[PDB]
Amino acid sequence: MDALDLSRWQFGITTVYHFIFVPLTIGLAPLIAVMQTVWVATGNDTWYRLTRFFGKLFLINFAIGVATGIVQEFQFGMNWSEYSRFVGDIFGAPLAMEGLAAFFFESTFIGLWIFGWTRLPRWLHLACIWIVAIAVNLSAFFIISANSFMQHPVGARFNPETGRAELESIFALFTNNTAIAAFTHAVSGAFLTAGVFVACVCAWWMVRSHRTGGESAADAATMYRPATILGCWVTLVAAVALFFTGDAQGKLMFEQQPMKMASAESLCLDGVVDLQRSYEEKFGPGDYRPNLFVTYWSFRAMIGFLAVPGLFALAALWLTRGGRIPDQRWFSWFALLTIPTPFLANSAGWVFTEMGRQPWVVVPNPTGDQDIRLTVAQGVSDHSVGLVVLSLVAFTLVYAVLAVIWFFLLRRYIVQGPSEHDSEPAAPRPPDADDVAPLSFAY
Amino acid sequence: MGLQELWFILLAVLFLGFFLLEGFDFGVGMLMSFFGRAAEKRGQDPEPYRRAALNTIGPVWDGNEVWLITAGGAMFAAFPEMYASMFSGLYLALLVILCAMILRIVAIEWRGKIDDPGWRRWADTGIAVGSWVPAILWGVAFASLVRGLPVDADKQIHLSFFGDLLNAYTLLGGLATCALFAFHGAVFVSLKTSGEIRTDAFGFARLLALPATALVAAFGVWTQVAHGTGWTWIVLAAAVIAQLVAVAQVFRGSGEGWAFGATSVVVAAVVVLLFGSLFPDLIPSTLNPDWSLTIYNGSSSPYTLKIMTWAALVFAPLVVVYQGWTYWVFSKRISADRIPAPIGLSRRSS
Ligand code: HDD
Ligand code: HEB
Ligand code: HEB
């Protein structure tokens, strides 16, 4: 009956929950890999404490990332059956290739990185985290090309004698114009998220440690200042990359999807009505407009939340010029306020992208065959409202409780700080064939 | 010859790997509570024993559960009609299975972050729920799939209460699957531990031997008499012989490797029998034996099947190789007096 609005709400809620945690993982895996490589190279135990202190947080995030992602795999067939019959022939290949080529790698090798701190040689233990860091980007590429088929589809035929998409070329699907730009933009966003996270955490701990004095006043200059500088440089280069990839992706959006563009730069001639008449003459009657309010303000918020990390990075790179250490109270508050803004910008961008193509679930390609198209009213499953209210309420409640617990754990472990006093030298890793009293990790 | 039949076989192999590698996961999850409870009856504290039980599937459980994800993805890629119909028909079962899996995933990995005794009770409850629920619901789902569903004309399986939980042949499937997974996990823990949790695992397996035997025997006979071809007699005989061998080996108390090979054979034989009692079609229809999906009106297309065949025949052997290697690496043995002291933060659960 009214299962359409409930299904849309459910899918949106769940994907936003998932992408709250995705970018931190994608951006923090390579940073931890670099922090471990610079320790294995130089031998300075300062980066060992940093890589452990951030590995704990990385794992706390990875658990809930996997848990939130697990449902998206089945939601397609559960709530969107008629859509899955239309695009299954094509949509199923990137998903299965992702499952076979990235999920297996990351899942198998993070378990080796967690438990092999004193069982594997050091070079193998470093290769483990490098493999994890590459796999968490391969999976992003696969899934983003999958989504980029839904808007500007390329390699399909639409066999009429069966009513299906029917894939015809995999090379044309994996080298899509939209897919490359979307992948680059999303990777830049994830790296911005992780860089801001590291820089703000280390800036807070640098302002806090300098005031304590005693013995910890020497951890600042040796450990918290270099990490802050690294984070700020990563943030700046990610901001420039975001600007350029976004300009490219906007140039793309102008030509292959004009309704989204006309809805982004709205007043607050008209475009949205001439395109309405054009689409009504092309594809019969119907209403072909997005919300015009969410689409107007998500673009603005996504672009405007970039001024906070940029200003923070530019101020932190100047407050620590030669070798000095900042002690201003307002700097720590600024570092604390700068943390949620990358998450907010990522969510705003993904909400603009998704709710902009809104009457469609497979957008008609202006230079395609015009038969590969599907509004989001012929894609939803035929269920009752009482069956969808159950899933919506259950998922919303479970994910809300898990997110509150996740925030509590991250705040606790950030306030605790790096357990430098709690036995953090480089582990000796003695050879095997010995009943060592601990195992170095046991869940 | 027959890319469609080849991909039927490949989907069967993915589900077989999932069942084989999650059997002892679900068994350990079901049994860790009793492992802890058997230590208090000796006077010792139960926390090292519960940690030693959970630690046998420490580094491998995530890679184990990826098999279900890749099996669902392979269904969506090769047989999208079966994917759509099956997952929109079994809506409540999938909803419950997913709500349990979420809790298990998050509890296993957040259990040891805080040192409060009340924080560990909810983690243990989450592990228990996420191990008990799928172990029954997957057997129920596959038994109902082999028995048949009400596919109306093209799609839209709408079943209420007697097509999903038909007492005959469907709850028996869930009971048999739960008992078999418990036995599998008991004899798996009996092989990765070193001296006093090993004897507890042997006791649990000696208690579980006969019920699992009787349940899987009854389920196999019922399946092969109601829905069965001529070459599945061999699979049923193999499963029965393997279960007898495993029982005889467990009641001795010294083999522990043959007793695991035998239970692996039993699980594989159950899966192979369910799929071979179904091969020609997918989701038979109880309304009309013409409205039922098959591999002939449910597959994708020649090109997609060829591309997926290349991808699978390139990536699956490598996955098997390096997962066998990671099982070899962490396979020394685990004692109860070898678990590190709990190192977690202070207090104030949530
Ligand atoms: C930018 C790339 C990207 C995007 C847009 C998505 N994911 Fe995701 N997903 C990831 C990339 C990723 C990840 C960030 O790499 C995760 C998070 C934590 C992790 O370890 O992997 C992950 C975890 C993850 C898992 C856990 C599997 C495992 O145990 O390794 C599954 C099944 C999915 N995702 C599926 C999906 C589906 C069906 C999505 C569509 C809405 C989706 N993800 C959004
Ligand atoms: C966060 C954010 C986000 C993300 C990440 C996403 C990711 C995605 N996505 Fe999106 N979506 C969205 C945001 C999103 N999304 C939303 C919000 C929704 C709901 C709403 C509407 O649509 O209206 C969606 C919904 C959706 C759907 C259903 C239909 C409609 O339209 O409704 C689909 C199919 C999709 C596809 C997708 C894919 C495949 C992916 C992976 C790549 N999506
Ligand atoms: C954080 C990070 C970030 C930031 C800062 C942003 C800010 C921005 N951005 Fe954003 N975005 C994003 C991340 C972002 N973003 C994302 C992730 C998204 C969604 C996804 C895709 O790509 O699709 C977006 C969405 C988006 C899009 C899409 C559209 C379509 O659909 O096609 C574009 C073009 C953009 C550009 C941009 C620019 C130019 C800027 C300024 C510089 N973006």
Author numbering:
A (entry chain A): 1 to 268, 313 to 487
B (entry chain B): 1 to 350
What does the original paper state about this entry?
Cytochromes bd are ubiquitous amongst prokaryotes including many human-pathogenic bacteria.
A 2.8 Å resolution structure was determined in lipid nanodiscs using cryo-EM. Thus, we believe that the Msm bd oxidase contains only two core subunits, CydA and CydB. The three heme groups (b558, b595, and d) unambiguously identified in Msm bd oxidase are organized in a triangulated arrangement near the periplasmic side of CydA. Noteworthy, in the Msm structure, the channel is also formed by a conserved structural topology and residues according to a comparison between the bd oxidases from E. coli and Msm, which suggests that the oxygen here may also access the active site through this conserved O2-channel (identified as channel 1).
